[PDB]
A paper describes a structure:
To further understand possible mechanistic differences resulting in activation of the PLCγ1S345F variant, we obtained a crystal structure for PLCγ1S345F and performed atomistic molecular dynamics (MD) simulations for membrane lipid interactions. The mutation is located at the rim of the active site opening of the TIM barrel, involved in interactions with the membrane lipids, including its substrate. This feature, also known as a hydrophobic ridge, is substantially enhanced by the S345F mutation. In an inactive form of the PLCγ1wt residue S345 plays a key role in autoinhibition. In PLCγ1S345F, the interaction between S345 and Y509 is lost. Similarly, within the sPH/TIM interface of the PLCγ1S345F variant, there are other changes that could result in a loss or in a formation of new interactions between the residues in the TIM barrel and the sPH domain. Uniquely, an increase in PLC activity for the PLCγ1S345F variant was also observed in the assay where substrate is hydrolysed in solution.
The current model for activation of PLCγ isozymes, following cell stimulation, outlines a shift of equilibria from an autoinhibited, inactive enzyme towards an active form, resulting from a large-scale conformational change and characterised by a release of autoinhibition and exposure of the membrane interaction surfaces. The area in PLCγ1 highlighted as a likely nucleotide binding site, using HDX-MS and additional experimental approaches, overlaps with one of the two autoinhibitory interfaces, an interface formed by interactions between the TIM barrel in the PLC-core and the sPH domain from the regulatory (γSA) region.
Numbering used by the authors: 19 to 190, 207 to 233, 245 to 524, 545 to 768, 791 to 934, 947 to 1215
Write the structure that this text describes.
């Protein structure tokens, strides 16, 4: 303790260290770093006084000594930026799979050691701070993000804009102390509705609270008043009011109801139970990762050492290595036949050794998919033995055993899963006869990234292409005049003067602007000069700013006043010292902002009906085409856009200085549209193509290969190199150039020139969207599939001169569809020749040695071909294992075969992994595999979908040690996941839940969420069901919900999960994930329980929680 109070102050003051930037463009610079300790943040900026970056300490995952980060590795050949590893350390922090990294370099060794021990103590202390102190640091954090820290107070409009940033909409000056009391009074006021039968500020005593924990919460220990007293003081952590008998204010009780100290999840179950770790390994569910090296999708994402660290530190116990021959005798790890980056086998092994047992004592299994040559396999084996040492399992635990060893017997051991040689042989036995080629990226002629021209904006975008022996699958696309005070020309006469006075008047009255607030415009009367307007005593004042180009140098001046070299210098001067105009003395104060910059934008039409907008946008064959139209009522607009081949509209309202869309508020139409070019507005669609007349006239015209054009007029050749033709003639093989002249073939003459405005280009059908209602759902691209080409019906030609700034282009055409063609670009000449050659070959078709040194390391986890007939017999070997891609496993976890699979899994390991078509790294449902006793159910840990949320829920029992004992009831001969009658007299469970409110729900975009909660039980099919509440309007900070009691009945509570998902109902009646919590049903507490909420990666959201009334029968 005393050491910690001395250590915090040290880092409070801070240090200077150079910072290696994750962005590729940026190069290392120095800043200065400190810990606020009242917000528990790390801050840094330029010099000793500013703020330029921040890190929440509650988000820190790992503080890592050394220079091991990709930020450091970017400059590791640059002699200027090759530091010494002792001088460095890395903070890995965040709430997604890919952590953020602060990669810092301090000179002394002991600055690093102090920071590591400092941040480490704070890291733990912040994570376990009791809820009032966490709420305290949150309020501090919101306050220090506005005009506070300078005048110590904040505006009532700066307070409005802050509450909307934390999901609260006020229907219509203060310091931090009044700010906190405001928040406290607001949360209690908003949710005083809740049924809460056990219930201004009133006081509840030590007696009252103890009575609560016993009659309503089932906390039997609370018959001891002293424990209840130590509980309340453990909540408040107020040193004051501790000598006196503890109490809760009435709003303090409601905050306790929402807090993690009141979680429905019994934290006693976060501990490992060693008593349950004595069955054979086959009896356990084992946390398992698929292609662990990958950070994103299966085709182009980066392989990272950090993913092994992250997965291991999430409690995963089975990880995967795809090993290929590497450049220097040492294997690289990457996903074969794809563009995922390569990492080295030695760096992977040191990462595994480093992090294997940080999160758990229990054994790690390395599943190795091996394509290496024998020699490099041999270096693998030598490296395993040398680096892992006695960590490596290298001989059986028990040579007389008839079952796998227990997790306890394998603690701190790492096991190797690899093909094992037949004893005395040099090939592995391969009794696997599946020439059903899977049709994935593993079994294809060529895979790669190629570029397709957008027909609306004519940019090139990347797409995943896969050529099989019959088809090509291509995917969806992958991965002074600027001055606020210068309003330019507002009109030609009195209208311009009236426009300035309206802008200035409205801005001043609406915002309570100060005197001196001003704008500048081009003079309506004195050509070349400007007029200045500023507010003084509720009246507008106008002043001429003269402009003279005598002596060839710009001279600007107000009448009878000083001379300046630019408009900007004049305005900047008079913002500091007063001007004298209309005989007043005034200083120039606030620039009035322009509210009408949308008027000159491509996407804006002052006069457009809804039908006209639909007609324009239906001509754009891509989603995300859009415009804004003014409407017939004042202060009213609409956005019109294309999504899924349909047209949508939504109203935009101007209210003074802001604009409103749904409940999302913006400064202006321009800032609105600018926001939805960067963030999605409908589903995943951003606004991409602004439609006006010019954009419509330019759609599709990228055609280059045997293009026909229709003659609009008769043309008689005025020269010998010129084409003669009649109106409506079809001119073929047209070479298109700018300058108004094209080349083409007509009436016997070849490649003769004609005026390009005398013809229209024939539509290229390839520019239209492919009909996706009958696309193969299981092509090698999975759900990323956009279009299929039937290769023998195509032909391909290189265009040597390239196209449109792409140098390497070929053209896919179909002889039997005139005018159809795709220009397809590659990144290199070699990549171009390889595609053309392999595609043409496909068109003209109408039709494993293993190194002993490595085989020796496979003790258990020995892959064999799956032998269904060996199950239940003396032939079955507990050391052998088999593997099932998702679709094969689906054939053994159904009503017919599931019991057989359960019998296999009691003795032997089975591994499940996703189907290769899931190129998007999505995940299959793990529960059907688990409920038949499969142990190694490999999911993509990088993907934040429901299967990974179930995985982390399941392994939450045991604190993510990664091994959960399967319940004995389902290692019974009788158990049948598709027949609840085999459960015999296993007692069921009835859960009744009322969702009372929520606090601190996260935002999804700029608006205010309208949240509902879906409550789900997941388990056997006979137990799985969903229910949901209504949604409430415009409140994510403290909503409450109508009375709507839910009932669930669970015949098998030993395999059942309770799941809460908070969704928003958005402005389009779409449902969007906001937060979730999933729990095994066995560890549920009853009464009025908080549901602490997590994000889609299962990482704890700050303060976000539900309050529920949950009652479970039969009573404990």
């Amino acid at each position: 303790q005393a050491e910690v109070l001395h250590l915090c102050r040290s880092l409070e003051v801070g240090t200077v260290m150079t910072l290696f930037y994750s962005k590729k463009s940026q190069r290392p610079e120095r800043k200065t770093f400190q810990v606020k300790l009242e917000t528990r943040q790390i801050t840094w900026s330029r010099g000793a006084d500013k703020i330029e970056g921040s890190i929440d300490i509650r988000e820190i995952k790992e503080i890592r000594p050394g220079k091991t980060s990709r930020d450091f590795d970017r400059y590791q050949e640059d002699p200027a930026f090759r530091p010494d590893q002792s001088h460095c350390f890395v903070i890995l922090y965040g709430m997604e799979f890919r952590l953020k990294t602060l990669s810092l370099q301090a000179t002394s060794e002991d600055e690093v050691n102090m920071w590591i021990k400092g941040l480490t103590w704070l890291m733990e202390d912040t994570l376990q701070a009791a809820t009032p102190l966490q709420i305290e640091r949150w309020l501090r954090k919101q306050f220090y993000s506005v005009d506070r820290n300078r005048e110590d107070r904040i505006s009532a409009k700066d307070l409005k804009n802050m509450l909307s940033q934390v999901n609260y909409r006020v229907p219509n000056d203060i310091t931090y102390g009044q700010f906190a009391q405001l928040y406290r009074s607001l949360m209690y006021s908003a949710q005083k509705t809740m049924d809460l039968p056990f219930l201004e500020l009133c006081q509840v005593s030590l007696s009252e609270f103890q009575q609560f924990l016993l009659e309503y919460q089932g906390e039997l220990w609370a018959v001891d008043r002293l424990q209840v007293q130590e509980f309340m003081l453990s909540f408040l952590r107020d040193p004051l009011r501790e000598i006196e008998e503890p109490y809760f204010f009435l709003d303090e009780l409601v905050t306790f109801l929402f807090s993690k100290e009141n979680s429905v999840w019994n934290s006693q179950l976060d501990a490992v139970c060693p008593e349950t770790m004595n069955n054979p390994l086959s009896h356990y569910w084992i946390s398992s990762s698929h292609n662990t090296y990958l950070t994103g999708d299966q085709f182009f994402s980066e392989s990272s050492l950090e993913a092994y660290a992250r997965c291991l530190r999430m409690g995963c116990r089975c990880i995967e290595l795809d090993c290929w021959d590497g450049p220097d005798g040492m294997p690289v790890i990457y996903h074969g036949h794809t563009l995922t980056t390569k990492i080295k086998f030695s760096d992977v092994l040191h990462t595994i050794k480093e992090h294997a047992f940080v999160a758990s004592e229990y054994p790690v299994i390395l599943s190795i998919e091996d394509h290496c040559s024998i020699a490099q396999q041999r270096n693998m084996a030598q490296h395993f033995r040398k680096v892992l040492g006695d960590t490596l399992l290298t001989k059986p635990v028990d040579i007389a055993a008839d079952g796998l060893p227990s997790p306890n017997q394998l603690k701190r051991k790492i096991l190797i899963k690899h093909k094992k040689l037949a004893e005395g042989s040099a090939y592995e036995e391969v009794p696997t006869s599946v020439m059903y080629s899977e049709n994935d990226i593993s079994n294809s002629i060529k895979n790669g990234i190629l570029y397709l021209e957008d027909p609306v904006n004519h940019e090139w975008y990347p797409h995943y292409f896969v050529l099989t022996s019959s088809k090509i699958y291509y995917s969806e696309e992958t991965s002074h005049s600027s001055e606020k005070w210068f309003h330019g020309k507002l009109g030609a006469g009195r209208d311009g003067r009236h426009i300035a006075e309206r802008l200035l008047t409205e801005y001043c009255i609406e915002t309570g602007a100060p005197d001196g607030s001003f704008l500048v415009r081009e003079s309506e009367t004195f050509v070349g000069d400007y007029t200045l307007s500023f507010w003084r005593n509720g009246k507008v004042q106008h002043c001429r700013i003269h402009s003279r180009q005598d002596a060839g140098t710009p001279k600007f001046f107000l009448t009878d006043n000083l001379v300046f070299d630019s408009l900007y210098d004049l305005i900047t001067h008079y913002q500091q010292v007063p001007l004298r105009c209309n005989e007043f003395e005034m200083r120039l104060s606030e620039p009035v902002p322009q509210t009408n910059a949308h008027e000159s934008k491509e996407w804006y039409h002052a006069s457009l009906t809804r039908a006209q907008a639909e007609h324009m946008l239906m001509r754009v064959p891509r989603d995300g085409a859009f415009l804004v139209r003014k409407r017939n009522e004042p202060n009213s607009y609409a956005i019109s856009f294309r999504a899924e081949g349909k047209i949508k509209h939504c109203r935009v309202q101007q209210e003074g200085q802001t604009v409103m869309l749904g409940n999302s508020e913006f400064d202006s139409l321009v800032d609105l549209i600018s926001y939805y070019e960067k963030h999605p507005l409908y589903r995943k669609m951003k606004l991409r193509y602004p439609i006006n007349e010019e954009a419509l006239e330019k759609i599709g015209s990228g055609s280059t290969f045997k293009c026909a054009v229709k003659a609009l007029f008769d043309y008689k050749a005025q020269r010998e190199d010129e084409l003669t033709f009649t109106k409506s003639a079809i001119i073929q093989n047209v070479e298109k150039q700018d300058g108004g002249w094209w080349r083409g073939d007509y009436g016997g003459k070849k490649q003769l020139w004609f005026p390009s405005n005398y013809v229209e280009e024939m539509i290229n059908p390839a520019i239209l969207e492919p009909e996706r209602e009958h696309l193969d759902e299981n092509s090698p691209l999975g759900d990323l599939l956009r279009g299929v080409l039937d290769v023998p019906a195509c032909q391909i030609a290189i265009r040597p001169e390239g196209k449109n700034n792409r140098l390497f282009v070929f053209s896919i055409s179909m002889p039997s569809v005139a005018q159809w063609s795709l220009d397809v670009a590659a990144d290199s000449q070699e990549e171009l020749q390889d595609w053309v050659k392999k595609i043409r070959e496909v068109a003209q078709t109408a039709d494993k040695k293993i190194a002993l040194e490595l085989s020796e390391l496979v003790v258990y986890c020995r892959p064999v071909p799956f032998d269904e007939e060996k199950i239940g017999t003396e032939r079955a070997c507990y050391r052998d294992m088999s593997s099932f891609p998702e679709t094969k496993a689906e054939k053994y976890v159904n009503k017919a075969k599931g019991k057989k699979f359960l019998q296999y899994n009691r003795l032997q390991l089975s591994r499940i992994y996703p189907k290769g078509q899931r190129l998007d790294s999505s995940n299959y449902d793990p529960l059907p595999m688990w409920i038949c006793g499969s142990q190694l159910v490999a999911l993509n840990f990088q993907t934040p979908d429901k299967p990974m949320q179930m995985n982390q829920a399941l392994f939450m029992a045991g604190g993510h040690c990664g091994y959960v004992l399967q319940p004995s009831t389902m290692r019974d001969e009788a158990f049948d996941p598709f027949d609840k009658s085999s459960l015999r007299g296993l007692e069921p469970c009835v859960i009744c839940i009322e969702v009372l409110g929520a606090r601190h729900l996260p935002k999804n975009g700029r608006g205010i969420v309208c949240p509902f909660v879906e409550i789900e039980v997941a388990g056997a099919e006979y137990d799985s069901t969903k229910q949901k509440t209504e949604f409430v309007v415009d409140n994510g900070l403290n909503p409450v919900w109508p009375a709507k009691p839910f009932h669930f009945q669970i015949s098998n509570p030993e395999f059942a999960f309770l799941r809460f998902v908070v969704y928003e109902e958005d402005m389009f009646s779409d449902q969007n994930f906001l937060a979730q919590a999933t729990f095994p049903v066995k560890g549920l507490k009853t009464g009025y329980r908080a549901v602490p909420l997590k994000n889609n990666y299962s990482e704890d959201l700050e303060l976000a929680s539900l309050l529920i009334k949950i009652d479970i029968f039969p009573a404990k």
